[PDB]
Structure formats: C-alpha cells, structure tokens
C-alpha cells in the first residue's frame, strides 16, 4: 500500500526541518498540502502504479478548508488500509519567539509566514464570536487617529 | 439592570482604542477579562448596589478557560434580563502587520503581546490534532542544529 506521515505543529517549532529529515530518509514530501489532497494523492498514486510507497504531508491547516480535527482524514484513509502517523511539532513560547526574531534577520519571508499563520489562527478561533457580533468594525488602512475616529463614529 | 458590551477582535485591530472610547463615554471597562468574571461581576454589582450601570469587557479569549463561542455567556446573562452587545474588531492582514511593525518600535510590550496572542490561537486551534498525534516533538531551547538532531533521533 502506502505509508503516510502527516506533519503539523506550531509556527517555528520545526515542521520544515521534519520535512527535510523525512525527504532525506526517502519520503516523498507534499508541503503546504491541505488534507483533501491526501486521499486524492493516495488514490492517484495507487492508480498511477507509483514507485512512491512513503508519502509525507506537511499539512496546510491555516486554510478555511480544514475542520478542527483529523477524524475525517483518518476514516477515509482507513477505507484504503492505511493508518497515518501524525507528528506534532511544538516548543515553548520563549523558543518560538527567539526563532521568529532570528527569522526576521535571516529568513524574512519565513518571518512573514509566521505572522500570517498566527493571524489565520486568530481568525479561525474567533469565527464563532464574529458570527454572533452585533457590530463589526473593520479598521483596515486607518492611522492611529483614523482608528479612533472610526470607533467614535461606530459607537455614536 | 446593567448594559453590557463585550469587545473582542484580532490583535492590532483596535480593541484597546475601543475600550478607551467606551471609558470616555462613561463605561466601566474591565480589561483582559475572561468570560466567567462577567456574570459574577454583574451579580456582584447588582448585590453591591453599584452606581455602575454600563459595563464593558475586553474579553480574554487566548485562555484555556474559554470555549469557542459566546452562547454560554449570552444564555447566562439572559437569566438576568441582560442582552450583551458584542463588538468585533478586525482589519486586513496588511494593516495588522503594519501595526505590529509599528508596535515593535513604539510599544514593544504590545508587540510581544501580539505574538503571544498568535501563538495562543495556534495552540488552541491545533489542540485536537495534538491530542491525536502519534509523536510529539518538543524543540524548546534547541539550536538550528539541535533541532535537526532531535528530529533525526525521534524518527529513528
């Protein structure tokens, strides 16, 4: 069949290094893949007569097309005699901040990706609260003063 | 009774300015308050014979002690004849990044709070995945090379 490893974790905790180690060990690594492509890729490879028997996926969880859990992926893989192995990368807040600050110097596009992942997680976490808000104030493009003006106007 | 306003939103979208505007309009503002304190505060104020009839709360959402929704708070306040008004602050990613970069210069402790809010949201969003992981790799304190060594060891 196919061995499947799924890599995820916190920004800066080492998902990129885990993918590099797996590639070095002979895995085919699909990076930034939202979960839907896993089954389609496995089904494709099975039909494709692929030499690839070891698939690792670095999961794109910062996408609206991803529920909170992996029970959907596990059950669909189960119907094809595959039990994925899930690897989760984490670290203390102090370590993650130190790595972000180093990324600002050495890998600025990685640093910007880290901010983008944090904001995407906030938006997903706050979505039920947003959906019940009585007033939403969008402060895009506003200066410090324009921010104050817009809120004063919104509150009457 | 008491008028209750609940303020939340994305890091850098203007929750602090909203709280300041409400304070200026006469509200008593409880900042960084997780939801549980709201009704205890209302019940206390009601029992205390408070002059405070206008309570605004900037909600502490980056807490393990906070489910995803506000339906628990609304129902509990409903049994006290109070309908809260929920204000949600948001902005584009480009605006939020620009404000974070300005905070790094002008309000560095607010910049650190923004990173801490992003990491807390990631941890909350990834909690179901973490709870199903086969392997958790904690990379706290590790150098770039030590990160690589720890993952190589974890993978065999």
Curated annotation (Swiss-Prot), chains A, B:
It comes from the Bacteria. Keywords: ATP-binding, GTP-binding, Nucleotide-binding. GTP binds at residues 60-63. Transmembrane segments: none annotated. ATP binds at residues 9-16. GO terms for cellular component: plasma membrane. Belongs to the RapZ-like family. This is Nucleotide-binding protein Rv1421. It comes from Mycobacterium tuberculosis (strain ATCC 25618 / H37Rv).
């Amino acid at each position: 069949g196919i061995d499947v490893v799924l890599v995820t974790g916190l920004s800066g905790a080492g998902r990129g290094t885990a993918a590099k180690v797996l590639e070095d060990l002979g895995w085919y690594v699909a990076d930034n893949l939202p979960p839907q492509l896993i089954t389609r890729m496995v089904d494709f490879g099975l039909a494709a007569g692929s030499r690839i028997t070891q698939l690792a996926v670095v999961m794109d969880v910062r996408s609206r097309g991803f529920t909170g859990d992996l029970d959907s992926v596990r059950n669909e893989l189960a119907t094809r005699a595959i039990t994925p192995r899930v690897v989760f990368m984490e670290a203390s807040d102090d370590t993650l901040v130190r790595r972000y600050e180093q990324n600002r110097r050495s890998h600025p596009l990685q640093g910007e990706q880290t901010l983008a992942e944090g904001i995407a997680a906030e938006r997903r976490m706050l979505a039920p609260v947003r959906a019940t808000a009585d007033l939403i104030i969008d402060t895009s493009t506003l200066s410090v003063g324009g921010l104050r003006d817009s809120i004063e106007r919104a509150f009457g």
